[PDB]
């Protein structure tokens, strides 16, 4: 038994509905699973006989002929952001045979963009870069300088007040280190904001 | 008891030295699983047992690893004189008559030449701007955990002794200290966002927590630093007008 999912990886604005993939070789499935990973959650469960089960906002179907299982994720949230894994039992075992993964990013839809390098000083003469605000067409850049360190962009709810937003980080013990550079790496909007001291 | 449980979470090992990994299945389970999983791939099958009868082990390396389920109960995963690539995460799952298998949180094990490559982390908080307070009305908090090894750590916010879930963000993946090289320590950023009128209240204590599992009172260690033990190393801030 092979199992295919595909995409590996999938990037969808958030309110799109998605699709994951899952087939497999051998079409003898006696239970197909759907899990979450952000160990693993249980999110559905298809018999030999059912075409289908839902859970919320995810709908499973399994093709018998085709042999292809689709997971449906419907009005995607930021929330829904992890990796998703398919397995299947074949007649005759008992174990399960999984796929290698899709990983799910779900981007926040930031309704005002406002991008801007900030920098911020440690409570107890360190500092690091903030880059916040930004809308989710920006990705973040790794850094070209091994002694500059720069994270991936993060995605923070605030839910009380209705709002999203991203951030990467960047610091180093260099000497000639400044926020103004710190992002050089990166597509950053021409409209940044780069606060005076 | 309703949930599989697995010890240890975490575990770190010295190339060379045996473990043992322990599953609880849900209570009275008949039918128990063994996955290993590498990082960002699927889980692979390794063992199954049918009460004590280990039915099917078609998915154990040919050596060093062995199952065990000796009253049909509690199962030990041994791994003898381990080796880097036996590195992973590894799953146990339980399953009743409906078939449907229920899976625990999984031991995560590294194996690493010496434990002399053990580290905790540095943690730092990191206070907001005033133009961003200003520009924006919040402020945002940064904590970063720097120099650990193994990757076995969980970063939490406090707020006057409350965790905080709402605002924060907490790298999904950690970077590598020393990226050219295949040895690395690793560090790790998370971020608080307040309103700036919560920030200015000088009353308002922010704490960033860092559990790292480490070394037990078993491990030996000669190196003349401190013993790099399970510990929490953590960093705060008080809010400012």
């Known amino acids: 038994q092979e199992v295919t999912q595909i995409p590996a990886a999938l990037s969808v604005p958030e309110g799109e509905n998605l699709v994951l993939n899952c087939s497999f070789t051998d079409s003898a499935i006696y239970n197909l699973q759907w899990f979450r990973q952000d160990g693993l959650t249980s999110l559905l469960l298809?018999?030999?006989?059912?075409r289908e089960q839902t859970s919320g906002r995810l709908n499973a179907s399994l093709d018998k002929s085709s042999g292809r299982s689709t997971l449906y994720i419907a009005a995607s949230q930021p929330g829904d952001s992890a990796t998703y894994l398919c397995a299947g039992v074949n007649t005759g075992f008992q174990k399960l045979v999984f796929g290698t993964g899709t990983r799910l990013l779900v981007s926040p839809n930031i309704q005002n963009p406002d991008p801007a390098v900030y920098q911020l000083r440690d409570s107890k003469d360190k500092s690091v870069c903030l880059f916040t605000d930004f809308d989710s067409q920006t990705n973040v850049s790794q850094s070209k300088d091994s002694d500059v360190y720069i994270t991936d962009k993060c995605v923070l709810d605030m839910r009380s007040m209705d709002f999203k937003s991203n951030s990467a980080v960047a610091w180093s013990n260099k000497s000639d280190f400044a926020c103004a550079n710190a992002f050089n790496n990166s597509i950053i909007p021409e409209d940044t904001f780069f606060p005076s001291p | 008891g309703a949930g599989v449980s697995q010890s240890p979470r975490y575990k770190v090992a010295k190339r060379g030295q045996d473990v043992a990994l322990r599953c609880d299945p849900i209570?009275?389970?008949?039918?128990l699983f063994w996955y290993q999983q590498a990082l960002g791939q699927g889980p692979e099958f390794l063992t199954y047992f049918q009460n004590e009868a280990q039915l099917d082990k078609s998915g154990l390396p040919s050596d060093r690893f062995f199952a065990e389920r000796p009253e049909g109960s509690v199962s030990t995963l041994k791994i003898q004189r381990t080796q880097q690539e036996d590195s992973a995460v590894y799953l146990c799952?339980?399953?009743?008559?409906?078939?449907?298998?229920?899976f625990g949180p999984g031991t995560r094990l590294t194996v690493t030449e010496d434990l002399k490559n053990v580290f905790p982390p540095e943690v730092a908080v990191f206070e907001p701007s005033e133009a961003e307070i200003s520009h924006t009305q919040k402020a945002t908090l940064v904590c970063l955990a720097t120099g650990f090894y193994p990757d076995h750590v969980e970063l939490s916010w406090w707020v006057n002794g409350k965790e905080v879930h709402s605002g924060v963000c907490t790298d999904p993946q950690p970077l590598k200290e020393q990226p050219a090289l295949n040895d690395s320590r690793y560090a790790l950023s998370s971020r608080l966002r307040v309103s700036a009128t919560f920030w200015q209240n000088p009353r308002n204590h922010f704490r960033c927590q860092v559990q790292f599992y480490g070394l037990s009172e078993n491990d030996e260690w000669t190196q003349d630093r401190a013993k790099p033990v399970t510990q929490i190393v953590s960093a705060e801030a008080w809010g400012r007008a």
């Open positions: 298809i018999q030999s006989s059912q």
């Open positions: 209570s009275g389970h008949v039918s």
């Open positions: 799952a339980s399953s009743s008559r409906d078939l449907e298998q229920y």
